[PDB]
Design a protein around this ligand. Structure first.
Ligand SMILES: *[C@@H]1O[C@H](CO)[C@@H](O[C@@H]2O[C@H](CO)[C@@H](O[C@@H]3O[C@H](CO[C@H]4O[C@H](CO[C@H]5O[C@H](CO)[C@@H](O)[C@H](O)[C@@H]5O)[C@@H](O)[C@H](O[C@H]5O[C@H](CO)[C@@H](O)[C@H](O)[C@@H]5O[C@H]5O[C@H](CO)[C@@H](O)[C@H](O)[C@@H]5O)[C@@H]4O)[C@@H](O)[C@H](O[C@H]4O[C@H](CO)[C@@H](O)[C@H](O)[C@@H]4O)[C@@H]3O)[C@H](O)[C@H]2NC(C)=O)[C@H](O)[C@H]1NC(C)=O
Ligand SMILES: *[C@@H]1O[C@H](CO)[C@@H](O[C@@H]2O[C@H](CO)[C@@H](O[C@@H]3O[C@H](CO[C@H]4O[C@H](CO[C@H]5O[C@H](CO)[C@@H](O)[C@H](O)[C@@H]5O)[C@@H](O)[C@H](O[C@H]5O[C@H](CO)[C@@H](O)[C@H](O)[C@@H]5O[C@H]5O[C@H](CO)[C@@H](O)[C@H](O)[C@@H]5O)[C@@H]4O)[C@@H](O)[C@H](O[C@H]4O[C@H](CO)[C@@H](O)[C@H](O)[C@@H]4O)[C@@H]3O)[C@H](O)[C@H]2NC(C)=O)[C@H](O)[C@H]1NC(C)=O
Ligand SMILES: *[C@@H]1O[C@H](CO)[C@@H](O[C@@H]2O[C@H](CO)[C@@H](O[C@@H]3O[C@H](CO[C@H]4O[C@H](CO)[C@@H](O)[C@H](O[C@H]5O[C@H](CO)[C@@H](O)[C@H](O)[C@@H]5O)[C@@H]4O)[C@@H](O)[C@H](O[C@H]4O[C@H](CO)[C@@H](O)[C@H](O)[C@@H]4O)[C@@H]3O)[C@H](O)[C@H]2NC(C)=O)[C@H](O)[C@H]1NC(C)=O
Ligand SMILES: *[C@@H]1O[C@H](CO)[C@@H](O[C@@H]2O[C@H](CO)[C@@H](O[C@@H]3O[C@H](CO[C@H]4O[C@H](CO)[C@@H](O)[C@H](O[C@H]5O[C@H](CO)[C@@H](O)[C@H](O)[C@@H]5O)[C@@H]4O)[C@@H](O)[C@H](O[C@H]4O[C@H](CO)[C@@H](O)[C@H](O)[C@@H]4O)[C@@H]3O)[C@H](O)[C@H]2NC(C)=O)[C@H](O)[C@H]1NC(C)=O
Ligand SMILES: *[C@@H]1O[C@H](CO)[C@@H](O[C@@H]2O[C@H](CO)[C@@H](O[C@@H]3O[C@H](CO[C@H]4O[C@H](CO)[C@@H](O)[C@H](O)[C@@H]4O)[C@@H](O)[C@H](O)[C@@H]3O)[C@H](O)[C@H]2NC(C)=O)[C@H](O)[C@H]1NC(C)=O
Ligand SMILES: CCCCCCCCCCCCCCCCCCCC(=O)O[C@H](COC(=O)CCCCCCCCCCCCCC)COP(=O)(O)OCCN
Ligand SMILES: CCCCCCCCCCCCCCCCCCCC(=O)O[C@H](COC(=O)CCCCCCCCCCCCCC)COP(=O)(O)OCCN
Ligand SMILES: *[C@@H]1O[C@H](CO)[C@@H](O[C@@H]2O[C@H](CO)[C@@H](O)[C@H](O)[C@H]2NC(C)=O)[C@H](O)[C@H]1NC(C)=O
Ligand SMILES: *[C@@H]1O[C@H](CO)[C@@H](O[C@@H]2O[C@H](CO)[C@@H](O)[C@H](O)[C@H]2NC(C)=O)[C@H](O)[C@H]1NC(C)=O
Ligand SMILES: *[C@@H]1O[C@H](CO)[C@@H](O[C@@H]2O[C@H](CO)[C@@H](O)[C@H](O)[C@H]2NC(C)=O)[C@H](O)[C@H]1NC(C)=O
Ligand SMILES: CC(C)CCC[C@@H](C)[C@H]1CC[C@H]2[C@@H]3CC=C4C[C@@H](O)CC[C@]4(C)[C@H]3CC[C@]12C
Ligand SMILES: CC(C)CCC[C@@H](C)[C@H]1CC[C@H]2[C@@H]3CC=C4C[C@@H](O)CC[C@]4(C)[C@H]3CC[C@]12C
Lengths: 58, 23, 191, 92, 23, 50
């Protein structure tokens, strides 16, 4: 009985901690993925100059 | 009996030039 | 002007003097891809599934051919995404534009392609392709977390997250009802 | 009526963003100038404050606090769950 | 300017027969 | 407007082409896709997957 009552308590704690970690993992992914997108937009892009000699592959 | 096909080297010259601005 | 096109792209124009003008998304007969070029061969051969013949010897006369000035041109980093979401040929810069003006041109448009509950895996795969040249370590990570939501199991985690995303307003509503009970139940313990 | 209900949905969905608040606020002013000139002059001011004053540090600060919103909530929730337990574990 | 050398295929026939006991 | 009865004709040897028939599946919301572009836009290919 005491073991069953203790088990119920310990289960609920691990079940609570389980969620509160998932809340923190999802929240951190949304923050970082959206910032990186912002930085991707403002990077310097490619240069083209119609030089064939520059693109030779041997 | 054993008939085979051995590869033997060769080559074709290919010149290339540019088109400034793509015009 | 920029415009999205279908891969693979091949264009070969036979010129009158006996050379060939080539623009192609893939290599063949040692011709580099993406940059166009005027091509000539010393002996008949098959390139891009057609025959490039050796031209007849010509006599040299006084030329009047023009020689245009050369020109470097800097494009926006995500030009491919800008051309794709318009579905028409669109203006992307000028010959003589500043770095600042060029960037502040599709930035608001691009920022508002944000993450959604309904295509997170398809979005995450775009972010990777966008990040690859900048930060290759991050790209490989993002690509992994992409395939986990799509592939692992029968995509059950993708499903689970998609659903928990759409439920957000209900969850808050319930959460609020719990607090209003908890507060009363707590205040109705204090002597 | 028909003329207005034609680009209204399109126009409404050009909303404020964490990443170009100053550039957005400057559009709102140019849009408001003929309607309410007093408001325009105000909006234009709050525009140049986020862009110009210092090295735009406030623009930076607000942009960053905007992107952090989901983390802050997450932490906030963890504080409540501690506070409630710590409070309930004071009552006799 | 860019001069290149493209390889082009070819082949030579080669027949072979055995020598029982190596004699 | 007036649709008139045509004048009787004499039959000669024909050279009219007969194209192959073709079923074509469009997206469910094709009308909303065409409306929010305000230009003529590409929506599928003849031989595209669902
Ligand atoms: C079918 O038709 C097509 C045409 O539709 C044919 O293709 C054409 O074929 C032509 C051959 O008859 C090619 O011409 C040749 O181009 C060569 C390369 O030219 C470029 O490089 C030069 C050198 O650059 C390096 O070295 C210099 C220092 O010397 C450095 O400064 C550089 O940094 C480099 O390191 C360079 O001089 C050229 O510059 C000129 O052109 C460019 C634009 O292309 C301009 O921006 C430049 O300002 C400059 O033009 C002006 O100045 C020059 C003089 O300096 C004037 O001639 C011009 O009129 C103009 O005012 C290029 O960057 C050349 O090396 C080669 O030279 C030969 O001929 C000269 C005499 O004319 C001799 O002195 C040389 O010794 C040499 O023999 C020649 O000009 C065409 O490029 C090519 N056209 C195209 C579009 O591809 C094709 O063959 C035909 N096919 C058949 C089967 O018939
Ligand atoms: C002004 O000008 C316009 C033209 O600009 C005129 O309109 C044209 O008028 C013509 C009459 O002269 C019409 O032609 C007629 O079409 C009829 C219908 O054809 C279709 O159905 C056929 C039968 O289908 C059912 O039955 C078969 C089995 O028998 C089943 O397999 C089916 O599932 C159906 O249940 C069918 O045979 C036809 O198929 C052919 O055409 C289609 C494309 O349209 C192709 O996909 C097919 O592959 C096939 O074409 C090939 O094979 C046939 C032979 O099988 C060849 O003839 C072709 O060259 C080709 O290789 C259609 O699906 C026909 O029934 C009708 O037949 C009469 O004539 C034949 C002899 O030619 C007799 O044997 C018959 O007994 C019968 O008398 C005839 O062909 C045109 O359709 C019409 N054009 C247009 C564009 O609307 C207009 O009248 C003019 N106005 C004035 C005022 O002058
Ligand atoms: C057309 O041509 C123009 C001019 O070349 C191109 O624009 C220039 O691009 C280059 C290369 O991408 C940029 O070079 C960088 O310069 C910065 C320093 O910039 C500061 O100092 C400059 C002094 O002359 C000044 O002009 C700049 O002013 C601009 O920017 C400010 C701030 O946004 C703005 O307020 C102004 O109005 C101007 O727009 C600015 O004060 C330098 O830090 C960079 O260094 C990097 O690269 C070098 C070399 O590889 C490397 O050694 C370093 O370690 C570092 O990695 C770099 O040199 C230049 O800033 C651009 N100039 C302008 C005016 O925008 C343009 O791209 C061409 N257009 C097209 C379509 O091709
Ligand atoms: C051009 O032509 C193609 C080919 O016909 C058209 O595409 C097909 O459309 C039909 C009709 O809408 C679809 O039929 C359904 O098929 C499923 C079963 O699909 C599964 O098994 C297939 C076995 O051959 C296989 O090809 C499928 O593979 C595709 O899908 C998977 C998963 O997304 C993907 O990974 C692959 O890459 C392929 O794309 C798949 O494994 C069946 O369940 C459906 O049953 C319904 O309909 C029947 C009949 O009414 C009914 O009895 C059932 O009760 C049920 O209501 C249905 O038969 C077919 O899946 C499509 N095929 C492809 C390859 O997409 C296409 O529409 C045409 N294009 C144009 C522009 O017209
Ligand atoms: C691809 O580009 C090549 C250049 O790298 C082309 O090669 C040139 O082609 C011409 C064709 O007229 C050759 O001219 C011949 O020269 C020989 C004798 O060679 C000597 O004299 C020439 C000048 O006449 C001199 O340039 C050489 O250095 C030698 O000293 C004569 O017998 C011929 O009649 C003719 O005049 C050039 O020699 C040759 N140059 C080089 C550097 O090889 C080649 O033709 C191009 N290929 C294609 C497919 O277009
Ligand atoms: C049967 C399977 C087992 C079940 C598994 C689930 C168990 C859960 C247990 C209970 C806990 C519930 C937790 C609630 C989560 C709700 C999700 C909210 C999603 C959400 O609203 O986000 C929106 C869309 O993003 C999204 O929806 C994207 C969400 C994130 C996807 C990525 C997930 C992988 C994370 C990887 C972690 C490691 C990375 C490194 C740290 C955007 O947010 P917004 O609505 O505020 O609007 C911002 C502007 N658009
Ligand atoms: C080093 C410098 C010193 C540090 C200074 C900061 C110190 C802060 C101290 C701690 C307190 C933190 C406060 C948290 C603020 C978080 C900001 C949230 C921003 C946010 O989510 O808003 C989104 C974007 O707007 C925005 O991000 C725009 C935000 C507002 C910009 C204007 C600021 C000036 C205000 C002028 C006041 C006077 C005006 C008259 C009253 C849109 O909102 P949503 O996400 O709900 O989505 C709605 C639909 N898109
Ligand atoms: C076109 O590309 C070629 C190759 O990058 C450039 O030629 C080189 O120029 C440098 C000097 O800037 C030399 O040190 C190299 O030896 C050259 N390489 C070859 C293979 O010739 C050329 O300058 C570029 N630009 C133009 C206008 O032709
Ligand atoms: C086209 O150019 C090629 C260059 O690859 C020539 O190849 C040479 O041919 C001779 C025989 O006359 C060989 O001895 C050389 O070794 C080859 N050179 C190489 C492989 O660099 C070829 O002869 C030319 N063809 C024509 C028809 O003129
Ligand atoms: C030697 O045998 C080879 C077999 O590789 C012959 O090669 C063929 O040559 C003809 C041209 O007459 C080509 O059309 C064939 O495609 C080649 N066959 C292959 C590669 O299997 C070659 O002609 C023979 N040489 C001599 C001198 O008789
Ligand atoms: C499950 C029962 C007990 C209800 C409890 C409420 C919990 C699960 C709800 C209430 C409010 C919710 C948060 C509201 C908003 C966001 C922002 C989003 O971008 C990430 C998730 C996050 C941070 C949610 C996570 C789950 C959350 C904390
Ligand atoms: C700083 C530590 C103690 C965390 C405390 C949590 C505080 C800072 C967080 C939790 C939830 C947050 C709010 C969530 C949503 C919005 C809507 C947005 O349009 C304006 C800001 C506003 C109103 C936020 C302000 C800051 C806020 C109140």
């Amino acid at each position: 009985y005491t073991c069953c009552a203790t088990s119920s308590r310990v289960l609920a704690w691990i079940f609570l901690v389980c969620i509160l970690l998932i809340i923190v993992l999802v929240s951190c992914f949304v923050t970082i993925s959206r910032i990186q997108w912002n930085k991707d937009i403002q990077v310097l892009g490619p240069v083209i100059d119609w030089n064939v000699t520059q693109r030779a592959v041997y | 009996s054993l008939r085979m096909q051995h590869p033997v080297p060769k080559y074709v010259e290919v010149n290339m030039t540019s088109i400034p601005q793509g015009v | 002007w920029a415009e999205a096109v279908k891969e693979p792209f091949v264009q070969v124009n036979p010129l009158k003097n006996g050379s060939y003008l080539v623009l192609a998304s893939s290599t063949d007969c040692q011709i580099p891809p993406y940059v166009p070029s005027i091509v000539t061969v010393n002996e008949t051969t098959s390139c891009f599934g057609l025959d490039f013949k050796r031209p007849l010897v010509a006599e040299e006369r006084l030329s009047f051919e023009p020689r245009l000035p050369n020109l470097q041109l800097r494009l926006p980093h995500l030009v491919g995404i800008i051309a794709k979401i318009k579905g028409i040929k669109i203006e992307v810069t000028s010959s003589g534009e500043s770095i600042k003006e060029q960037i502040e041109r599709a930035k608001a448009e691009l920022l508002r392609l944000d993450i959604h509950e309904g295509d997170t895996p398809a979005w995450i795969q775009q972010l990777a392709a966008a990040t690859k040249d900048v930060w290759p370590a991050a790209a490989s990570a993002l690509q992994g977390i992409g395939n986990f939501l799509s592939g692992t199991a029968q995509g059950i985690f993708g499903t689970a997250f998609s659903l928990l995303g759409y439920l957000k307003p209900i969850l808050i509503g319930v959460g609020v009802i719990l607090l209003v009970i908890l507060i009363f139940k707590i205040v109705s313990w204090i002597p």
